[PDB]
Design a protein around this ligand. Structure first.
Ligand code: FES
Ligand SMILES: [K+]
Ligand SMILES: [Mg+2]
Ligand SMILES: [Mg+2]
Ligand SMILES: [Mg+2]
Ligand SMILES: [Mg+2]
Ligand SMILES: [Mg+2]
Ligand SMILES: [Mg+2]
Ligand SMILES: [Mg+2]
Ligand SMILES: [Mg+2]
Ligand SMILES: [Mg+2]
Lengths: 122, 97, 86, 100, 137, 58
RNA sequence: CCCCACUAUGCUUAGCCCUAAACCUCAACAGUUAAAUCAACAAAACUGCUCGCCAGAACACUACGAGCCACAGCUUAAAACUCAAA
């Protein structure tokens, strides 16, 4: 299916970041994935401190990899990212653009519930 | 029979159903700016739908996106990211007297 | 512990008015439910007891909001008697 | 050739008005209690409007005024009630006086 | 400019100053308001301890420590030792809902310190350790 | 414990107690009058008597 | 009952045990709101069809028999004596 890899990389110089991305995209292809696009979301301060591979991180490079892969590649890729020392945090989710949003007519009002109690005099 | 008798039909004056501010829009966990508009600035607590004004479907979408974004490294948990404090105030809550 | 400090639950004092800053902070923590949450967490509330409390609190909200809605609806009728003497 | 009730109802101004929310109507003050003006505007129920602060003395019994209607009858069903509670008055906003 | 209750964010260029010091440079008064005691420690922005006072160190014992006046006395004592070390403005970080939560802050002010901000850091577990069983009273 | 040296502080405490003594006398009057209250339970119950909730059919 | 300390235990894995006010004490499916609405209370009153279950209290979540990884257990489950009530 179509997946989205949300990849937070260690803050590095341009050469080491390109080597990490190439090494990560090749890992996807080695597992049978068809990589569709690579998006750079920019280097930013993390929302909190993240400890990864005996190091503390406060900034990271946010990248996205849109790709298709067999269902068995996800588990194998997650294991690969856990060993890459230049990856702070990597998560694979089902691509949000696959889920088609159903149409909505609006808010249907809810009337106050009726006949909850008998009408006998108490 | 008679021309002036009422005729059966649907209410012509019926108003269109109201929609939430996010009706028809995609809620992504990477759009931290939008998600930040539905958490407390001081505590990061997700606002209930009585504060956000969202429909049930979008209250769930926002909630699930926030929880995903927080643990994936996109959004803080204990406070609203200060970068997003000057965004439009869409929630119905006032903390200053 | 891993987050930045002096952002969460932080209120700045204006013109040395520490009372108003503390009241604002207490109002913030109260509205977000933290004060009541801290109190309920001092001793363990068993799940059966928590479910009963939530049911009681939800039924109280419905009753209180419906009584308030009726009070506001009838308040206009609190005007002086237009037909006094009849 | 006697007009039927169905005909009277179809061609009545109250029928032709449609929904009452945000409709401008002409009312007449028929009863006054202190600064509460009781105004009939052609509906089942009168509305009660407070005397405006400006030109309050111009509003007297018989004075015709302009109203913006909100509801012809204020009614609501409350928790546990079997029927709707009615206050037996219309909801309207007093705009001013009508003059020629 | 209008007043902002939100604290200045470190790394941005704010105009607020206190004795020529930025918000990130103001010392911190850590108040631990427990149910049976109140502890106050003033530290520098670099985490250097400057003064410590608690209801117990001010000569209160047993239930008297868990009072507002006991915390107020601890605040004055901590303020006095901190003022000698050059402290005027402090950032208050209070954790706990004890009786000396607010009184400890008053004592810091009566002792000559100016509170520029108040921070709550009461630990709230998001799901955490199981607390002790309820009391039968 | 010499009152001669603590005059200003004593006069403060004395005035503060007097203000709190009068304040209770003020509050009590305004509480019964309802000057600050949204409505008095007594007044708010006479209004409900006129529009009683009807959980039964008539 | 209140305070402190600490164990079995609450967790995981692999097997047992098979019990709860396991109760929303309101069976499944289909249907109705009219007639008589209806002991009381509770969560208005009923029809069709089917399975399960019940027939004074207590003895009795007991005895015996039988089955079961259960061996101070579980399930099924009586009788005698006693009472005019429960
Ligand atoms: S009202 Fe349409 S999605 Fe919310
Ligand atoms: K039950
Ligand atoms: Mg143990
Ligand atoms: Mg676990
Ligand atoms: Mg159960
Ligand atoms: Mg049963
Ligand atoms: Mg069955
Ligand atoms: Mg029997
Ligand atoms: Mg048993
Ligand atoms: Mg047995
Ligand atoms: Mg046996």
């Amino acid at each position: 299916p179509r997946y989205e890899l949300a990849l937070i990389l260690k803050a590095m110089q341009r050469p080491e970041t390109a080597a990490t991305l190439k090494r990560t995209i090749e890992a996807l292809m080695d597992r049978g994935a068809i990589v569709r696009d690579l998006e750079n979301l920019g280097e930013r301060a993390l929302p909190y401190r993240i400890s990864a591979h005996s190091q503390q991180h406060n900034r990271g490079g946010y990248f996205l990899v849109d790709f298709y892969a067999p269902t068995a590649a996800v588990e194998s890729m997650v294991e690969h990212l856990s060993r890459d020392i230049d990856v702070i945090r990597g998560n694979i989710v089902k691509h949000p653009l696959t889920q088609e949003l159903k149409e909505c007519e609006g808010i249907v009002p809810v009337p106050l519930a009726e006949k909850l109690y008998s009408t006998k005099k108490r | 029979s008679n021309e002036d008798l009422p005729i059966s039909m649907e209410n012509p004056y019926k108003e269109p159903l109201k929609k939430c501010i996010l009706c028809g829009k995609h809620v992504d966990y990477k759009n931290v700016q939008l998600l930040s508009q539905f958490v407390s600035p001081f505590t990061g607590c997700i606002y209930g739908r009585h504060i956000t004004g969202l429909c049930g479907k979008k209250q769930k979408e926002i909630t699930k996106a926030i929880k995903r974004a927080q643990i994936m490294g996109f959004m803080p948990v204990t406070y609203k990211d200060p970068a997003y404090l000057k965004d439009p105030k869409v929630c119905n809550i006032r903390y200053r007297e | 512990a891993k987050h930045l400090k002096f952002i969460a639950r932080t209120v700045m004092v204006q013109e040395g008015n520490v009372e108003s800053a503390y009241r604002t902070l207490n109002r913030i923590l109260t509205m977000d439910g933290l004060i009541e949450d801290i109190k309920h967490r001092r001793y363990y509330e068993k799940p059966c007891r928590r479910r009963q409390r939530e049911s009681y609190e939800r039924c109280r909200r419905i009753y209180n909001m419906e009584m308030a809605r009726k009070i506001n609806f009838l308040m206009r009728k609190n005007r002086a008697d237009p037909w006094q003497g009849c | 050739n006697v007009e039927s009730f169905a005909s009277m109802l179809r061609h009545s101004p109250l029928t032709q008005m449609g929904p009452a929310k945000d409709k401008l109507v002409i009312g007449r003050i028929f009863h006054i209690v202190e600064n509460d003006l009781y105004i009939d505007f052609g509906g089942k129920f009168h509305c009660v409007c407070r005397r405006p602060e400006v030109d309050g003395e111009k509003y007297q019994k018989g004075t015709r005024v302009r109203l913006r209607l909100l509801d012809l009858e204020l009614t609501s069903r409350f928790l546990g009630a079997t029927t709707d509670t009615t206050v037996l008055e219309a909801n309207a906003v007093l705009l001013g006086i009508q003059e020629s | 400019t209008k007043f902002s209750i939100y604290p200045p964010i470190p790394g941005e260029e704010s105009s607020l100053r206190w004795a020529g010091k930025k918000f990130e440079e103001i010392p911190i008064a850590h108040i631990k308001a427990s149910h049976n005691n109140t502890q106050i420690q003033v530290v520098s922005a670099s985490n250097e301890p400057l003064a410590f006072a608690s209801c117990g160190t001010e000569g209160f014992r047993n239930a008297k420590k868990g009072t507002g006046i006991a915390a107020q006395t601890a605040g004055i004592a901590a303020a006095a030792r901190a003022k000698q070390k050059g402290v005027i403005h402090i950032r208050v970080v209070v954790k706990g809902l004890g009786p000396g939560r607010l009184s400890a802050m008053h004592g810091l002010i009566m002792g000559g310190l100016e509170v520029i901000s108040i921070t709550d850091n009461t630990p709230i577990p998001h799901x955490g350790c199981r607390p002790r069983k309820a009391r039968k009273l | 414990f010499r009152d001669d040296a603590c005059r200003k502080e004593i006069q403060g405490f004395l005035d503060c107690a007097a203000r709190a003594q009068e304040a209770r006398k003020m509050r009590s009057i305004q509480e019964t009058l309802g000057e600050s209250g949204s409505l008095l339970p007594n007044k708010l119950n006479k209004l409900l008597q006129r529009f009683p909730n009807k959980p039964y059919l008539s």
